[PDB]
Amino acid sequence: WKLLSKAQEK
């Protein structure tokens, strides 16, 4: 999930 992957996609 984007909101869950955003942590590594900053």
From Swiss-Prot:
It is found in: Secreted; Cytoplasmic granule. It comes from the Eukaryota. Coiled coil: none annotated. Poly-N-acetyllactosaminic carbohydrate moiety seems to be needed for TLR4 activation. Belongs to the transferrin family. Monomer. Found in a complex with LTF, CLU, EPPIN and SEMG1. Found in a complex with MPO and LTF; interacts directly with CP, allows Fe(3+) incorporation into LTF and activation of CP ferroxidase activity. Transferrins are iron binding transport proteins which can bind two Fe(3+) ions in association with the binding of an anion, usually bicarbonate. Lactoferricin binds to the bacterial surface and is crucial for the bactericidal functions. Has some antiviral activity against papillomavirus infection. N-terminal region shows strong antifungal activity against C.albicans. Contains two BBXB heparin-binding consensus sequences that appear to form the predominate functional GAG-binding site. This is Lactotransferrin. It comes from Bos taurus (Bovine). The chain holds residues 287 to 296 of 708 of the full protein.
